[PDB]
Amino acid sequence: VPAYPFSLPHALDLDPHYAELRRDEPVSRVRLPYGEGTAWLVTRMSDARIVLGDSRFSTAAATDPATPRMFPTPPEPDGVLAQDPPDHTRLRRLVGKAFTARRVEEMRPRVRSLVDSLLDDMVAHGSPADLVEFLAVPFPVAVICELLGVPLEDRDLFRTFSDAMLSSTRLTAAEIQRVQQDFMVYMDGLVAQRRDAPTEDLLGALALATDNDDHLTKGEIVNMGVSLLIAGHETSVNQITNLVHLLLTERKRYESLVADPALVPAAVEEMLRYTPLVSAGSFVRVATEDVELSTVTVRAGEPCVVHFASANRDEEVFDHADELDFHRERNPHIAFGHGAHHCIGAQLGRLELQEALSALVRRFPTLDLAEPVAGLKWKQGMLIRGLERQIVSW
């Protein structure tokens, strides 16, 4: 019956029907914009974890044009998220051997160098300043560049490919393609150079990854680096604005970090739990067998959407579920998903948000929102919520 996106997003606010569903119909039929039939909407954490972390669901099945979806275009099946276990598993493994926790934590001194530079320019420009232009946009692209080992001299041209994607950019017809193909050249050229001569960075290590005699192709290393640049940029950008937004606008939260900057990591986790960043939820899962859920049981062709943000507000698992508690002891959120398709960039994402917040706290203990909240330029966040602008004073 009900059309799925129940509403267009206001701010970081949740449509009130997810909570109602969470108590009354945790698993609920809905009709998504496109594709055919209906889908199971999964609102709570228990069911979410089953659906997201059970071998009995497929994401490759949902590349079928007659599967319910959000965009008119269906999904290409060679995309990571759409890939199913045997191959996906091979994939996660190989990049796994390069996108390691160690490499990501070893970014930290460098990444902290970049944030402090960016904030230096913000101080140079004076006392009100658009946090989006000075911090949120450049910071994620610069971090990815550094991780890929994009050579220092032509990152500015990485900056234009990246933010020539974002929710809107040049709008110059579809010759955003003449942006794709000459950049696609670049990556291929770069991937080739490091395959011959590897370096301390993702590409160099994607070049060397192995798994009992198994390889990544020049082609596979291109599709990942790009897939990673796309994914990481617009999300990280928006999330930066979302956290700042939550911290100011209640502004005792920000104070609580100034007073105690050691709380930044716990705060970020808690803020990841709370922010409904992903507005329509996760990539579509299509049950391959019969999986029993909380209240219904799902049969073999029916698709489900897991809504992460509602799972993250499930009052069965989080006390004071709809409040920000930076001192919460237990926080089993799935802001980064779960199971096989758990976010590949989860740690780099935590790195970004830790260093950003901690920098703003050291350097700008007087930070404050410098426009009225009611008027804030929220993106039309069908996919990803975030702010188009964020003026702040100090």
Ligand X SMILES: Clc1ccccc1C(c1ccccc1)(c1ccccc1)n1ccnc1
Q: Per-residue x/- mask for ligand X, residues 196 to 235, rule CB under 6 A?
A: ----------------------------------xx--xx
The CA distance from 152 to 145, in Å, is 9
**Residue 158 CA neighbour count, 13 Å, CB half:** 28
DSSP string, 185-225: HHHHHHHHHHHHS--SSHHHHHHH--SSS----HHHHHHHH
Q: Could you say whether residue 92 binds ligand HEM (CB under 6 A)?
A: yes
Q: Could you say whether residue 60 binds ligand X (CB under 6 A)?
A: no
Q: Are 20 and 41 within 8 A, CB to CB?
A: no
Return the number of the residue (231 or 258) whose C-beta is nearest ligand HEM.
Answer: 231
102 is in an annotated binding site: no
Q: Could you say whether residue 176 binds ligand X (CB under 6 A)?
A: no
Number of residue whose CB is nearest ligand X: 231
Q: Per-residue x/- mask for ligand HEM, residues 321 to 340, rule CB under 6 A?
A: --------------xxx---
Nearest to 201 by CA among 126, 317, 102, 345: 102
| Radius of gyration in angstroms for the set of CA atoms belonging to the chain, rounded to a whole number | 21
Nearest to 132 by CA among 284, 237, 248: 237
The CA distance from 387 to 381, in Å, is 9
Nearest distance in Å: CB 384, ligand X: 5
Query: 270, 352, 356, 358: which is the annotated catalytic residue?
Result: 352
Nearest distance in Å: CB 59, ligand X: 10
Q: Which of residues 237-266 bind ligand HEM (CB under 6 A)?
A: 239
The CA distance from 70 to 125, in Å, is 41
Q: Are 213 and 241 within 8 A, CB to CB?
A: no
- For residue 387, the 8-state DSSP code is B
Binding partner of residue 161 among ligand HEM, ligand X, none, CB under 5 to 8 Å per kind?
none
Among 241, 282, 310, 354, contact with ligand X (rule: CB under 6 A): 282
Residue type present at position 267: A
**Residue 306 CA neighbour count, 13 Å, CB half:** 30
Return the number of the residue (23 or 219) whose C-beta is nearest ligand HEM.
Answer: 219
Q: Are 75 and 63 within 8 A, CB to CB?
A: yes
What are the residue numbers of the active site? Answer: 231, 234, 236, 343, 352
Residues in binding site for heme b? 88, 92, 283, 285, 341, 343
Residues of this chain that bind ligand X (CB under 6 A): 79-81, 230-231, 234-235, 278, 282-283, 343, 383-384
Residues forming the site for ligand HEM (CB under 6 A):
52, 80-81, 92, 227-228, 231-232, 235-236, 239, 277-278, 282-283, 308, 335-337, 341, 343-345, 348-349
